[PDB]
Amino acid sequence: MASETFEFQAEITQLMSLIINTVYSNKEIFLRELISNASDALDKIRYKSLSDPKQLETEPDLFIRITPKPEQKVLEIRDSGIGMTKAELINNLGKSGTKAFMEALSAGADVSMIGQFGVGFYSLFLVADRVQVISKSNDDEQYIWESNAGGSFTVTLDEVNERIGRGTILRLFLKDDQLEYLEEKRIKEVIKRHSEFVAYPIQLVVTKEVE
Amino acid sequence: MASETFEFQAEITQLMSLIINTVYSNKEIFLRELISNASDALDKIRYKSLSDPKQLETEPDLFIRITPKPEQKVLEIRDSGIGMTKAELINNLGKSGTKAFMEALSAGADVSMIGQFGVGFYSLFLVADRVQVISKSNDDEQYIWESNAGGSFTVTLDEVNERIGRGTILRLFLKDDQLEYLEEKRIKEVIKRHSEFVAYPIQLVVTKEVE
Ligand SMILES: O=C1NCC/C=C/CCC[C@@H](C(=O)NCc2ccccc2)C(=O)Cc2c(Cl)c(O)cc(O)c21
Ligand SMILES: O=C1NCC/C=C/CCC[C@@H](C(=O)NCc2ccccc2)C(=O)Cc2c(Cl)c(O)cc(O)c21
């Protein structure tokens, strides 16, 4: 099952290198950005369902779900939002609040403004050196978008991951010095601090040994 | 991706109908049987690794993991044991401690003896009317074995489930009147009662809303 490869627009590669290498000390804000994007995608599928309730049937429950996978150094953020088709994955993450945000950064803006420029997605490279976006839109098959902060990304039909009824999984491959965010206490703390007003249940998946 | 279909040996179909329809009141013993089978598979991969440690590299951690999926009425029991190939799935579950166990039942034996006759796997039909066995052996690709208590089962190359490094997932589709076993308290209780001496960590995956 072959993967297709695509090149990032110049201003994206720049931003991503301008973030994976940063020594900025408030790295935890990535989670607010991802939760926000999730909330948005949920809003869209819900708004859409107003004039077509059948859209919900692929996944009746509207939720945000966070799943640490410590043994893999992975953190997953899932939502049952509207999702993205193959074309949307290729196009959407391929533009500029970018150049303008980079300019604000140069002038001393705090990285946390990133979401204001509509490019908060890339805040994930604060804690991760690699990401897979797994997405299922009602209008397409499930696909995997993958990037390692480099200049190119891949898109591949998904034949290896669990079936999403509908929506998106952000699978973050955390940096060796950020395993921090695999911990339940740490995670809940970050959520309480920046995501107080979310209209959708935020679920935490925790694995505990029975003793 | 086509599924292959196979017919059960006569004495298996019988046993399975002789269990899905039973009014036996101590249904919880299914979990002990499945945990035991898991422990066995872990023993085997560990014993095997004695003369070939590389066998462990597909999944270094040896564990039993229980994951309720309430919204799907599903309970999953996973282990990182030795797993089963396509041929093993077709053959292994296709024989008789069977006929002998059925005879013991007719005479008044308790269903809990089932494991003594080497057919404890089928105790799952006490709480489930459908099961998928998802398995990954180091020697084959990942496959799905599926049965609905009928006379035939299917085997299909797995292109829809999460990747198992190595081992087996029993995915139980619980009966409407047995959702019971999706609850953390209920589950831990059953484990403590019948699986005190398990050499491997038994993990429980619990999903909780952040509030
Ligand atoms: O699935 C998602 N969005 C719903 C469809 C609407 C998209 C509108 C524009 C925002 C969207 C986006 O930036 N997509 C481009 C993109 C494509 C591939 C990878 C990353 C980003 C977008 O936010 C994609 C997205 C992200 Cl980044 C997320 O963390 C969670 C999500 O549910 C989604
Ligand atoms: O993967 C498993 N076993 C390791 C390989 C050794 C098998 C030895 C014989 C027991 C085995 C078995 O009954 N297999 C036949 C079978 C084939 C297909 C579906 C169900 C059962 C067997 O117990 C398969 C098995 C079950 Cl049922 C389970 O609940 C958990 C498991 O890890 C395994």
Side-chain angles (χ1 to χ4, degrees), chain A residues 1-6 8-53 55-72 74-92 94 96-98 100-184 186-207 209-210, chain B residues 1-6 8-53 55-72 74-92 94 96-98 100-184 186-207 209-210:
Chain A
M1 197 53 263
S3 73
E4 297 180 55
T5 304
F6 305 87
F8 276 113
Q9 205 239 353
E11 290 70 13
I12 301 310
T13 306
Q14 199 182 335
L15 182 57
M16 291 175 54
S17 191
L18 179 68
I19 285 173
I20 198 181
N21 285 309
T22 195
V23 292
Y24 178 82
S25 60
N26 189 229
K27 277 166 170 45
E28 80 197 25
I29 187 205
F30 80 96
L31 190 53
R32 184 191 116 253
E33 304 302 328
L34 303 186
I35 288 175
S36 178
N37 286 5
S39 179
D40 293 346
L42 285 157
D43 288 338
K44 286 172 161 49
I45 193 59
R46 185 165 55 83
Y47 180 95
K48 175 169 194 164
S49 60
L50 292 178
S51 303
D52 193 18
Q55 293 283 338
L56 290 179
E57 294 187 5
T58 45
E59 177 56 80
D61 287 317
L62 308 180
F63 63 86
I64 304 175
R65 185 178 297 152
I66 297 172
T67 303
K69 296 181 178 178
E71 77 285 336
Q72 314 175 40
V74 160
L75 178 71
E76 293 181 356
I77 302 87
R78 175 174 175 183
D79 65 71
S80 45
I82 189 173
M84 292 175 285
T85 64
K86 181 188 179 182
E88 288 170 319
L89 295 167
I90 289 170
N91 175 109
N92 284 359
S96 184
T98 296
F101 172 69
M102 315 187 78
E103 211 69 44
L105 275 182
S106 284
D110 187 279
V111 182
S112 49
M113 283 192 63
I114 190 166
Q116 312 257 101
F117 291 78
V119 294
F121 164 77
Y122 300 99
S123 67
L124 70 86
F125 293 103
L126 292 166
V127 302
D129 50 39
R130 181 190 173 197
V131 53
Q132 290 172 357
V133 175
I134 307 166
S135 190
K136 180 61 179 61
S137 155
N138 290 342
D139 301 325
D140 209 353
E141 300 290 320
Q142 189 166 307
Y143 278 87
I144 309 159
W145 178 100
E146 180 166 18
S147 172
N148 59 346
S152 68
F153 65 89
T154 64
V155 176
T156 313
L157 184 68
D158 191 335
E159 306 184 314
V160 300
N161 295 303
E162 64 177 323
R163 292 306 88 173
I164 309 186
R166 184 198 62 252
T168 298
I169 296 177
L170 259 65
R171 181 179 286 159
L172 307 190
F173 294 80
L174 301 172
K175 297 157 166 179
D176 281 339
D177 80 282
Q178 217 78 178
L179 310 193
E180 182 169 330
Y181 297 98
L182 296 169
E183 302 169 350
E184 174 185 8
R186 185 63 169 119
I187 296 169
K188 306 191 55 172
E189 169 190 341
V190 174
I191 286 183
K192 289 165 158 51
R193 181 181 304 100
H194 289 282
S195 297
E196 174 182 4
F197 304 106
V198 177
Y200 310 94
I202 301 172
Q203 305 163 342
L204 184 51
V205 178
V206 177
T207 307
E209 181 172 340
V210 170
Chain B
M1 197 53 263
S3 73
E4 297 180 55
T5 304
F6 305 87
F8 276 113
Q9 205 239 353
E11 290 70 13
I12 301 310
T13 306
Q14 199 182 335
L15 182 57
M16 291 175 54
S17 191
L18 179 68
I19 285 173
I20 198 181
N21 285 309
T22 195
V23 292
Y24 178 82
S25 60
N26 189 229
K27 277 166 170 45
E28 80 197 25
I29 187 205
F30 80 96
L31 190 53
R32 184 191 116 253
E33 304 302 328
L34 303 186
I35 288 175
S36 178
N37 286 5
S39 179
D40 293 346
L42 285 157
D43 288 338
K44 286 172 161 49
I45 193 59
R46 185 165 55 83
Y47 180 95
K48 175 169 194 164
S49 60
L50 292 178
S51 303
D52 193 18
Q55 293 283 338
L56 290 179
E57 294 187 5
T58 45
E59 177 56 80
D61 287 317
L62 308 180
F63 63 86
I64 304 175
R65 185 178 297 152
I66 297 172
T67 303
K69 296 181 178 178
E71 77 285 336
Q72 314 175 40
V74 160
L75 178 71
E76 293 181 356
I77 302 87
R78 175 174 175 183
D79 65 71
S80 45
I82 189 173
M84 292 175 285
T85 64
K86 181 188 179 182
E88 288 170 319
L89 295 167
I90 289 170
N91 175 109
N92 284 359
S96 184
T98 296
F101 172 69
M102 315 187 78
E103 211 69 44
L105 275 182
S106 284
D110 187 279
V111 182
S112 49
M113 283 192 63
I114 190 166
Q116 312 257 101
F117 291 78
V119 294
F121 164 77
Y122 300 99
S123 67
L124 70 86
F125 293 103
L126 292 166
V127 302
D129 50 39
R130 181 190 173 197
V131 53
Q132 290 172 357
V133 175
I134 307 166
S135 190
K136 180 61 179 61
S137 155
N138 290 342
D139 301 325
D140 209 353
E141 300 290 320
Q142 189 166 307
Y143 278 87
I144 309 159
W145 178 100
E146 180 166 18
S147 172
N148 59 346
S152 68
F153 65 89
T154 64
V155 176
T156 313
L157 184 68
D158 191 335
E159 306 184 314
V160 300
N161 295 303
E162 64 177 323
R163 292 306 88 173
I164 309 186
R166 184 198 62 252
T168 298
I169 296 177
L170 259 65
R171 181 179 286 159
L172 307 190
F173 294 80
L174 301 172
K175 297 157 166 179
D176 281 339
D177 80 282
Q178 217 78 178
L179 310 193
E180 182 169 330
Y181 297 98
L182 296 169
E183 302 169 350
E184 174 185 8
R186 185 63 169 119
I187 296 169
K188 306 191 55 172
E189 169 190 341
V190 174
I191 286 183
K192 289 165 158 51
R193 181 181 304 100
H194 289 282
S195 297
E196 174 182 4
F197 304 106
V198 177
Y200 310 94
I202 301 172
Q203 305 163 342
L204 184 51
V205 178
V206 177
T207 307
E209 181 172 340
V210 170

Short mmCIF file of all heavy atoms in Angstrom, two decimals, chain A residues 45-95, unseen atoms left out:
data_model
loop_
_atom_site.label_atom_id
_atom_site.label_comp_id
_atom_site.label_asym_id
_atom_site.label_seq_id
_atom_site.Cartn_x
_atom_site.Cartn_y
_atom_site.Cartn_z
N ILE A 45 -19.25 19.66 12.37
CA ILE A 45 -20.07 18.48 12.10
C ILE A 45 -21.44 18.62 12.74
O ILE A 45 -22.43 18.09 12.25
CB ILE A 45 -19.40 17.16 12.59
CG1 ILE A 45 -20.13 15.95 12.02
CG2 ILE A 45 -19.38 17.09 14.11
CD1 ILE A 45 -20.16 15.92 10.50
N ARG A 46 -21.50 19.35 13.85
CA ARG A 46 -22.76 19.58 14.53
C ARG A 46 -23.58 20.63 13.77
O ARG A 46 -24.77 20.44 13.56
CB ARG A 46 -22.52 20.03 15.97
CG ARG A 46 -23.81 20.19 16.77
CD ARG A 46 -23.51 20.29 18.26
NE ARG A 46 -22.56 21.35 18.55
CZ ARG A 46 -22.89 22.63 18.68
NH1 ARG A 46 -24.15 23.01 18.53
NH2 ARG A 46 -21.96 23.53 18.95
N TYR A 47 -22.94 21.72 13.36
CA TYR A 47 -23.62 22.71 12.55
C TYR A 47 -24.14 22.07 11.28
O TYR A 47 -25.29 22.29 10.90
CB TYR A 47 -22.70 23.88 12.18
CG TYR A 47 -23.41 24.93 11.34
CD1 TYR A 47 -23.97 26.05 11.93
CD2 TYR A 47 -23.52 24.79 9.96
CE1 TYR A 47 -24.61 27.00 11.16
CE2 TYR A 47 -24.16 25.73 9.20
CZ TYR A 47 -24.70 26.83 9.80
OH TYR A 47 -25.33 27.77 9.02
N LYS A 48 -23.29 21.29 10.63
CA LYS A 48 -23.67 20.61 9.40
C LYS A 48 -24.88 19.70 9.61
O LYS A 48 -25.76 19.62 8.75
CB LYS A 48 -22.51 19.78 8.86
CG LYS A 48 -22.86 18.93 7.64
CD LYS A 48 -21.62 18.35 6.99
CE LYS A 48 -21.93 17.80 5.61
NZ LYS A 48 -20.69 17.59 4.80
N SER A 49 -24.91 19.03 10.75
CA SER A 49 -25.95 18.06 11.03
C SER A 49 -27.32 18.72 11.21
O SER A 49 -28.35 18.05 11.19
CB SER A 49 -25.59 17.23 12.27
OG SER A 49 -25.43 18.07 13.41
N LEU A 50 -27.32 20.04 11.39
CA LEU A 50 -28.57 20.78 11.53
C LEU A 50 -29.47 20.58 10.31
O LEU A 50 -30.69 20.44 10.44
CB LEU A 50 -28.31 22.27 11.74
CG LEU A 50 -27.67 22.66 13.07
CD1 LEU A 50 -27.42 24.17 13.14
CD2 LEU A 50 -28.53 22.20 14.25
N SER A 51 -28.86 20.54 9.12
CA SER A 51 -29.60 20.39 7.88
C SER A 51 -29.43 19.00 7.27
O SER A 51 -29.82 18.75 6.13
CB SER A 51 -29.17 21.45 6.86
OG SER A 51 -29.34 22.75 7.39
N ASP A 52 -28.83 18.10 8.05
CA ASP A 52 -28.63 16.72 7.62
C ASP A 52 -28.15 15.89 8.80
O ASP A 52 -26.95 15.60 8.92
CB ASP A 52 -27.62 16.66 6.47
CG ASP A 52 -27.62 15.32 5.78
OD1 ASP A 52 -28.60 14.57 5.94
OD2 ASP A 52 -26.64 15.02 5.07
N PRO A 53 -29.08 15.49 9.67
CA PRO A 53 -28.79 14.74 10.90
C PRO A 53 -28.12 13.40 10.64
O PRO A 53 -27.44 12.88 11.52
CB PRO A 53 -30.18 14.53 11.52
CG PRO A 53 -31.14 14.68 10.38
CD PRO A 53 -30.53 15.72 9.50
N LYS A 54 -28.31 12.85 9.44
CA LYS A 54 -27.73 11.55 9.10
C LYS A 54 -26.21 11.59 9.13
O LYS A 54 -25.55 10.56 9.22
CB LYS A 54 -28.23 11.09 7.72
CG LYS A 54 -27.76 9.70 7.33
N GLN A 55 -25.65 12.80 9.05
CA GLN A 55 -24.21 12.98 9.09
C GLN A 55 -23.63 12.48 10.41
O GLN A 55 -22.46 12.08 10.47
CB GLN A 55 -23.84 14.45 8.88
CG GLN A 55 -24.17 14.99 7.49
CD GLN A 55 -23.16 14.55 6.44
OE1 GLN A 55 -22.03 14.19 6.76
NE2 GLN A 55 -23.57 14.57 5.18
N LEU A 56 -24.45 12.49 11.45
CA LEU A 56 -24.01 12.08 12.79
C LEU A 56 -23.94 10.57 12.96
O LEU A 56 -23.26 10.08 13.86
CB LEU A 56 -24.93 12.67 13.85
CG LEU A 56 -24.88 14.17 14.10
CD1 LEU A 56 -25.89 14.56 15.17
CD2 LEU A 56 -23.48 14.59 14.50
N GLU A 57 -24.65 9.84 12.11
CA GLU A 57 -24.82 8.40 12.29
C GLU A 57 -23.52 7.59 12.23
O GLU A 57 -23.45 6.48 12.75
CB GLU A 57 -25.84 7.84 11.29
CG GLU A 57 -27.25 8.35 11.50
CD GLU A 57 -28.27 7.66 10.62
OE1 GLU A 57 -27.89 6.70 9.90
OE2 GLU A 57 -29.45 8.06 10.64
N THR A 58 -22.49 8.14 11.59
CA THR A 58 -21.20 7.46 11.51
C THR A 58 -20.49 7.44 12.87
O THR A 58 -19.57 6.65 13.09
CB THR A 58 -20.27 8.11 10.47
OG1 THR A 58 -20.32 9.54 10.63
CG2 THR A 58 -20.71 7.75 9.06
N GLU A 59 -20.93 8.32 13.76
CA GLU A 59 -20.39 8.41 15.11
C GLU A 59 -21.25 9.37 15.92
O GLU A 59 -20.94 10.56 16.02
CB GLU A 59 -18.93 8.89 15.08
CG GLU A 59 -18.31 9.07 16.45
CD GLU A 59 -18.37 7.82 17.29
OE1 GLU A 59 -17.52 6.92 17.09
OE2 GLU A 59 -19.27 7.73 18.15
N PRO A 60 -22.34 8.85 16.50
CA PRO A 60 -23.38 9.61 17.20
C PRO A 60 -22.85 10.46 18.35
O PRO A 60 -23.42 11.52 18.63
CB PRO A 60 -24.31 8.52 17.73
CG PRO A 60 -24.12 7.38 16.81
CD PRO A 60 -22.67 7.41 16.44
N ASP A 61 -21.79 10.01 19.01
CA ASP A 61 -21.27 10.73 20.16
C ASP A 61 -20.23 11.77 19.78
O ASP A 61 -19.29 11.49 19.03
CB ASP A 61 -20.69 9.74 21.18
CG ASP A 61 -21.77 8.97 21.92
OD1 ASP A 61 -22.78 9.59 22.31
OD2 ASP A 61 -21.61 7.75 22.09
N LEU A 62 -20.40 12.98 20.31
CA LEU A 62 -19.48 14.07 20.05
C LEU A 62 -18.55 14.26 21.24
O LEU A 62 -18.98 14.66 22.32
CB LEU A 62 -20.25 15.36 19.77
CG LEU A 62 -21.33 15.25 18.69
CD1 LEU A 62 -22.03 16.59 18.48
CD2 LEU A 62 -20.72 14.74 17.38
N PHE A 63 -17.27 13.97 21.04
CA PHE A 63 -16.32 13.98 22.15
C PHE A 63 -14.91 14.37 21.74
O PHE A 63 -14.54 14.30 20.57
CB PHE A 63 -16.29 12.59 22.79
CG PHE A 63 -15.80 11.51 21.86
CD1 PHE A 63 -14.45 11.27 21.71
CD2 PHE A 63 -16.70 10.76 21.12
CE1 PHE A 63 -14.00 10.28 20.85
CE2 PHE A 63 -16.26 9.78 20.27
CZ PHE A 63 -14.91 9.53 20.13
N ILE A 64 -14.12 14.76 22.73
CA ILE A 64 -12.68 14.89 22.58
C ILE A 64 -12.04 13.87 23.52
O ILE A 64 -12.39 13.80 24.70
CB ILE A 64 -12.19 16.29 22.95
CG1 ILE A 64 -12.92 17.35 22.11
CG2 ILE A 64 -10.68 16.40 22.77
CD1 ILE A 64 -12.58 18.77 22.49
N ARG A 65 -11.11 13.07 23.01
CA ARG A 65 -10.52 12.00 23.80
C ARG A 65 -8.99 12.01 23.74
O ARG A 65 -8.40 12.03 22.66
CB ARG A 65 -11.06 10.64 23.35
CG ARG A 65 -10.60 9.46 24.20
CD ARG A 65 -11.23 8.16 23.72
NE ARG A 65 -12.68 8.20 23.85
CZ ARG A 65 -13.52 7.52 23.07
NH1 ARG A 65 -13.06 6.75 22.10
NH2 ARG A 65 -14.83 7.62 23.27
N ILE A 66 -8.37 12.02 24.91
CA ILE A 66 -6.92 12.07 24.99
C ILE A 66 -6.39 10.73 25.50
O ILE A 66 -6.81 10.26 26.56
CB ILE A 66 -6.46 13.20 25.92
CG1 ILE A 66 -6.88 14.56 25.35
CG2 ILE A 66 -4.95 13.14 26.12
CD1 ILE A 66 -6.63 15.71 26.29
N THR A 67 -5.47 10.14 24.75
CA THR A 67 -4.94 8.82 25.07
C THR A 67 -3.41 8.79 25.07
O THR A 67 -2.79 8.75 24.01
CB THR A 67 -5.44 7.75 24.08
OG1 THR A 67 -6.87 7.73 24.08
CG2 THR A 67 -4.91 6.37 24.47
N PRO A 68 -2.80 8.80 26.26
CA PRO A 68 -1.35 8.58 26.32
C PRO A 68 -1.00 7.12 26.04
O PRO A 68 -1.71 6.21 26.47
CB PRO A 68 -1.00 8.96 27.76
CG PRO A 68 -2.27 8.78 28.53
CD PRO A 68 -3.38 9.13 27.58
N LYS A 69 0.09 6.91 25.31
CA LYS A 69 0.61 5.57 25.06
C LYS A 69 2.09 5.56 25.43
O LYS A 69 2.96 5.51 24.56
CB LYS A 69 0.44 5.19 23.59
CG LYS A 69 -1.01 5.08 23.13
CD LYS A 69 -1.10 4.66 21.67
CE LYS A 69 -2.54 4.50 21.23
NZ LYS A 69 -2.63 4.12 19.79
N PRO A 70 2.37 5.59 26.75
CA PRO A 70 3.72 5.78 27.32
C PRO A 70 4.79 4.88 26.70
O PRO A 70 5.89 5.35 26.42
CB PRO A 70 3.51 5.44 28.79
CG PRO A 70 2.08 5.75 29.05
CD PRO A 70 1.36 5.36 27.79
N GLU A 71 4.46 3.61 26.49
CA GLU A 71 5.44 2.66 25.97
C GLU A 71 5.87 2.98 24.54
O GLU A 71 6.84 2.40 24.03
CB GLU A 71 4.91 1.22 26.07
CG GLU A 71 3.89 0.85 25.00
CD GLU A 71 2.53 1.46 25.25
OE1 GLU A 71 2.21 1.78 26.41
OE2 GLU A 71 1.77 1.61 24.27
N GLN A 72 5.16 3.89 23.89
CA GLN A 72 5.49 4.29 22.53
C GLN A 72 5.90 5.75 22.48
O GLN A 72 6.22 6.28 21.41
CB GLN A 72 4.29 4.06 21.61
CG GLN A 72 3.61 2.71 21.79
CD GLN A 72 2.36 2.58 20.94
OE1 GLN A 72 2.33 3.01 19.78
NE2 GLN A 72 1.32 1.99 21.51
N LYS A 73 5.90 6.40 23.64
CA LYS A 73 6.17 7.83 23.72
C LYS A 73 5.20 8.61 22.84
O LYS A 73 5.57 9.60 22.21
CB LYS A 73 7.62 8.13 23.33
CG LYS A 73 8.66 7.57 24.29
CD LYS A 73 10.06 7.73 23.73
CE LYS A 73 11.11 7.19 24.69
N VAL A 74 3.95 8.14 22.81
CA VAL A 74 2.92 8.76 21.97
C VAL A 74 1.77 9.32 22.79
O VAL A 74 1.34 8.73 23.78
CB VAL A 74 2.36 7.75 20.96
CG1 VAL A 74 0.99 8.20 20.45
CG2 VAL A 74 3.33 7.54 19.80
N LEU A 75 1.28 10.48 22.37
CA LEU A 75 0.06 11.05 22.91
C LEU A 75 -0.93 11.27 21.77
O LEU A 75 -0.61 11.95 20.79
CB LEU A 75 0.34 12.38 23.61
CG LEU A 75 -0.86 13.12 24.20
CD1 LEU A 75 -1.39 12.39 25.43
CD2 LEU A 75 -0.47 14.55 24.56
N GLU A 76 -2.12 10.69 21.89
CA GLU A 76 -3.15 10.86 20.87
C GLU A 76 -4.27 11.79 21.32
O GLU A 76 -4.77 11.69 22.44
CB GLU A 76 -3.74 9.50 20.46
CG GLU A 76 -2.76 8.60 19.73
CD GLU A 76 -3.37 7.27 19.30
OE1 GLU A 76 -4.55 7.01 19.64
OE2 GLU A 76 -2.67 6.50 18.62
N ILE A 77 -4.65 12.71 20.44
CA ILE A 77 -5.82 13.55 20.67
C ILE A 77 -6.85 13.26 19.59
O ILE A 77 -6.63 13.56 18.41
CB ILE A 77 -5.48 15.06 20.67
CG1 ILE A 77 -4.42 15.38 21.72
CG2 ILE A 77 -6.74 15.87 20.92
CD1 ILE A 77 -3.00 15.23 21.23
N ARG A 78 -7.98 12.69 20.00
CA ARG A 78 -9.02 12.29 19.07
C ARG A 78 -10.30 13.11 19.26
O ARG A 78 -10.63 13.51 20.38
CB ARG A 78 -9.34 10.80 19.23
CG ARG A 78 -10.51 10.29 18.39
CD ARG A 78 -10.67 8.78 18.51
NE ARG A 78 -11.85 8.28 17.80
CZ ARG A 78 -12.24 7.01 17.79
NH1 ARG A 78 -11.54 6.10 18.45
NH2 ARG A 78 -13.33 6.65 17.13
N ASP A 79 -11.00 13.36 18.16
CA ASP A 79 -12.32 13.97 18.22
C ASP A 79 -13.22 13.29 17.20
O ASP A 79 -12.74 12.70 16.23
CB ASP A 79 -12.25 15.48 17.96
CG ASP A 79 -11.79 15.80 16.54
OD1 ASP A 79 -12.56 15.57 15.60
OD2 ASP A 79 -10.65 16.30 16.38
N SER A 80 -14.53 13.36 17.42
CA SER A 80 -15.49 12.85 16.45
C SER A 80 -16.07 14.00 15.63
O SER A 80 -17.26 14.04 15.35
CB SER A 80 -16.59 12.06 17.15
OG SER A 80 -17.08 12.74 18.29
N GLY A 81 -15.20 14.93 15.24
CA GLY A 81 -15.60 16.07 14.43
C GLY A 81 -15.87 15.68 12.99
O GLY A 81 -16.07 14.50 12.68
N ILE A 82 -15.86 16.68 12.11
CA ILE A 82 -16.23 16.48 10.71
C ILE A 82 -15.18 15.71 9.91
O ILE A 82 -15.50 15.08 8.90
CB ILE A 82 -16.51 17.83 10.01
CG1 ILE A 82 -17.10 17.61 8.62
CG2 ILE A 82 -15.25 18.67 9.93
CD1 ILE A 82 -17.56 18.90 7.95
N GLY A 83 -13.93 15.76 10.36
CA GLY A 83 -12.86 15.04 9.69
C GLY A 83 -12.39 15.72 8.42
O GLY A 83 -12.88 16.79 8.05
N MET A 84 -11.44 15.09 7.74
CA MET A 84 -10.88 15.62 6.51
C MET A 84 -10.71 14.52 5.47
O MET A 84 -10.31 13.40 5.80
CB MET A 84 -9.52 16.28 6.78
CG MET A 84 -9.59 17.56 7.61
SD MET A 84 -7.94 18.17 8.00
CE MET A 84 -7.44 17.01 9.27
N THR A 85 -11.03 14.83 4.22
CA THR A 85 -10.83 13.91 3.11
C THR A 85 -9.36 13.88 2.71
O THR A 85 -8.56 14.66 3.22
CB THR A 85 -11.63 14.35 1.87
OG1 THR A 85 -11.13 15.62 1.42
CG2 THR A 85 -13.11 14.48 2.19
N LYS A 86 -9.01 12.99 1.79
CA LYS A 86 -7.65 12.94 1.27
C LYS A 86 -7.23 14.30 0.69
O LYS A 86 -6.14 14.79 0.97
CB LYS A 86 -7.51 11.86 0.20
CG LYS A 86 -6.11 11.74 -0.36
CD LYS A 86 -6.07 10.79 -1.55
CE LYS A 86 -4.67 10.69 -2.12
NZ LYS A 86 -4.64 9.80 -3.32
N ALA A 87 -8.11 14.89 -0.11
CA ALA A 87 -7.82 16.17 -0.74
C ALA A 87 -7.63 17.27 0.30
O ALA A 87 -6.72 18.10 0.18
CB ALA A 87 -8.92 16.55 -1.72
N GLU A 88 -8.48 17.29 1.32
CA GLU A 88 -8.37 18.27 2.39
C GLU A 88 -7.06 18.14 3.15
O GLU A 88 -6.42 19.13 3.48
CB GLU A 88 -9.57 18.19 3.34
CG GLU A 88 -10.87 18.72 2.73
CD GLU A 88 -12.09 18.42 3.58
OE1 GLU A 88 -12.18 17.30 4.14
OE2 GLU A 88 -12.96 19.30 3.70
N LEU A 89 -6.64 16.90 3.42
CA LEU A 89 -5.37 16.67 4.10
C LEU A 89 -4.21 17.21 3.28
O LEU A 89 -3.32 17.88 3.80
CB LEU A 89 -5.17 15.18 4.38
CG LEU A 89 -6.15 14.51 5.35
CD1 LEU A 89 -6.01 12.99 5.28
CD2 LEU A 89 -5.93 15.02 6.77
N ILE A 90 -4.23 16.92 1.98
CA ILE A 90 -3.18 17.38 1.07
C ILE A 90 -3.15 18.90 0.95
O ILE A 90 -2.09 19.51 0.94
CB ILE A 90 -3.34 16.76 -0.33
CG1 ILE A 90 -2.99 15.27 -0.30
CG2 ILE A 90 -2.47 17.48 -1.35
CD1 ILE A 90 -3.36 14.54 -1.57
N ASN A 91 -4.33 19.51 0.87
CA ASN A 91 -4.45 20.95 0.67
C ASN A 91 -4.32 21.76 1.95
O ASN A 91 -3.46 22.64 2.06
CB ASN A 91 -5.78 21.28 -0.02
CG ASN A 91 -6.01 22.78 -0.16
OD1 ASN A 91 -5.95 23.33 -1.26
ND2 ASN A 91 -6.31 23.44 0.95
N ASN A 92 -5.18 21.46 2.92
CA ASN A 92 -5.24 22.21 4.17
C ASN A 92 -3.89 22.36 4.88
O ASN A 92 -3.48 23.46 5.20
CB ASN A 92 -6.29 21.60 5.11
CG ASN A 92 -7.71 21.95 4.70
OD1 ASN A 92 -7.93 22.66 3.72
ND2 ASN A 92 -8.68 21.44 5.46
N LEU A 93 -3.21 21.24 5.12
CA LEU A 93 -1.84 21.29 5.60
C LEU A 93 -0.90 21.14 4.42
O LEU A 93 -0.50 20.03 4.06
CB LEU A 93 -1.55 20.19 6.62
N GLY A 94 -0.56 22.27 3.80
CA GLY A 94 0.29 22.27 2.63
C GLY A 94 1.34 23.36 2.68
O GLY A 94 2.33 23.31 1.95
N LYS A 95 -2.55 30.49 2.67
CA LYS A 95 -1.88 29.72 3.72
C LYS A 95 -1.45 30.61 4.89
O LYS A 95 -1.50 30.19 6.05
CB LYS A 95 -0.68 28.98 3.14
#
